[PDB]
């Protein structure tokens, strides 16, 4: 059994983005989906769409990368330089509104699960709610 | 008790002209003239490249010695600026500039820093109609620093203000010469002070 499907999803993408894969597939889940919405909304991925692979529903996640660079190692600068799961099973992380962090001095994001929905660190801070600090992304 | 002794021997150790002698730091006798090397046996010897700690240590000493203050007052004065809101650098300077004895010299009352220190110490300075004899008195903006009417007839006082006729005073300052008055208009800014010191070095000296 897969333990932490979100962490697997983030790691699917973390592995996907380092070999510069066009797309990778992750098992479909409404929470996973509500996560990818923030990512496509925030411009970290090109986007996503549902897909059935051998009859099983997935999420085609299309990654994005910067410009091809100059001499040795012309491999483009990453768009998602960092992704880290935070509120893991067996060590759960919850923040209040005041306990919301400032990722990368504001240049990053922090995806929050709140009773009002899945939100970015800015989104919940202007909403004035807290919850499960799921992950840093930047 | 502050430092008492040879003054123009520390004009050379810092490498920059320090006018704590008052006069004779301007006439060709300062010992900064034709003698800019540090004192002692090994002054004229070639000096090695100072360490990073050496650079900040001297910058603090170059500033502390200018005002004539012991390190104990000097250090605690600095710690105040860090707690107070604003840039720690220029905040500290205005605090030194707000010392009563410094204001006496700044207003051109005294020849030197040490002279202003003794002028205040012997109670000759009036602040808003009240005599004050503490050189470490913090002058507020608007305070009236005047000369005691008892001492307005002292020939040393009329001596200095005779050379003050026509001399300009600090932008944050203003004095009445015939009445021997003077007012602390504002805390001086960084650009108000012509001090040959880099504040950031001294601040970095205290991060350790």
């Amino acid at each position: 059994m897969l333990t932490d499907p979100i962490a697997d999803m983030l790691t699917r993408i973390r592995n996907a983005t380092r070999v510069y894969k066009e797309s990778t597939d992750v098992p479909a889940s409404r929470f996973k989906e509500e996560i990818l919405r923030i990512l496509a909304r925030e411009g970290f991925i090109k986007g996503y769409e549902r897909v059935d692979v051998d009859g099983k529903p997935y999420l085609r996640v299309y990654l994005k990368y910067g410009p091809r660079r100059q001499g040795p190692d012309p491999r483009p600068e990453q768009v998602i330089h960092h992704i880290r799961r935070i509120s893991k099973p067996g060590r759960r992380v919850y923040v209040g509104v005041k306990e919301i962090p400032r990722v990368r001095r504001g240049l990053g994001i922090a995806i929050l699960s709140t009773s009002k929905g899945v939100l970015t660190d800015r989104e919940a801070r202007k909403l004035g709610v807290g919850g499960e600090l799921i992950c840093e992304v930047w | 008790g502050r430092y008492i002794g040879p003054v123009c021997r520390l004009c050379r150790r810092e490498g920059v002209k320090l006018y704590l002698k008052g006069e004779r730091c301007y006439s060709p006798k300062c010992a900064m003239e034709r003698r800019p090397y540090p004192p002692g046996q090994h002054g004229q010897k070639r000096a090695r490249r100072p360490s990073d700690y050496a650079v900040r240590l001297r910058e603090k000493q170059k500033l502390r010695r200018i005002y004539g203050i012991s390190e104990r007052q000097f250090r605690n004065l600095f710690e105040e600026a860090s707690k107070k809101k604003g840039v720690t650098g220029s905040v500290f300077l205005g605090l030194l500039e707000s010392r009563l004895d410094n204001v006496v010299y700044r207003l051109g009352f005294a020849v030197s820093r040490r002279q202003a220190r003794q002028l205040v110490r012997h109670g000759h300075i009036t602040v808003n109609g009240r005599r004050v004899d503490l050189p470490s008195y913090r002058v507020r903006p608007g305070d009236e620093i005047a000369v005691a009417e008892k001492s307005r007839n002292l020939e040393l006082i009329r001596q200095n203000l005779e050379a003050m006729k026509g001399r300009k005073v600090g932008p944050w300052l203003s004095l009445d010469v015939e009445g021997m008055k003077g007012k602390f208009l504002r805390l001086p800014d960084r650009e108000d002070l012509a001090l040959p010191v880099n504040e950031q070095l001294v601040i970095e000296f205290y991060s350790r």
Binding site: G90, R91, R92, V93, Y94 | -
Partner: protein, 99 residues
């Protein structure tokens, strides 16, 4: 407010009394993982109404005896011995790990 807790009966062997086990969820004060702590309460059953395994509510009460300050309020869930099974076996494991 008199404090009120919900637990399970784990001992019926006494007279006019029943032992009640109450779980508590709370995050760790440094490691922040949610941790499960339990506490046994001696509850008063004046009519021997409640039986082993019944899920009951308890209330802060005027002391009955040494080690008795809670009265049984009402039945929440009737007779779930799966919770009893967990309690007894943890007690029974202690028969090893002695010598």
């Amino acid at each position: 407010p008199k404090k009120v807790l919900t637990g399970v009966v784990v001992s019926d062997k006494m007279q006019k009394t029943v032992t009640v086990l109450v779980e508590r969820q709370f995050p760790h004060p440094l490691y922040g993982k949610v941790i499960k702590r339990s506490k046994k309460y001696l509850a008063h059953d004046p009519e021997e109404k409640y039986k082993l395994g019944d899920v009951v509510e308890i209330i802060e009460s005027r002391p009955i005896s040494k080690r008795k300050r809670f009265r049984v309020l009402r039945l929440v869930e009737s007779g779930r011995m799966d919770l009893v099974e967990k309690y007894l076996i943890r007690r029974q494991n202690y028969q090893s790990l002695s010598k």
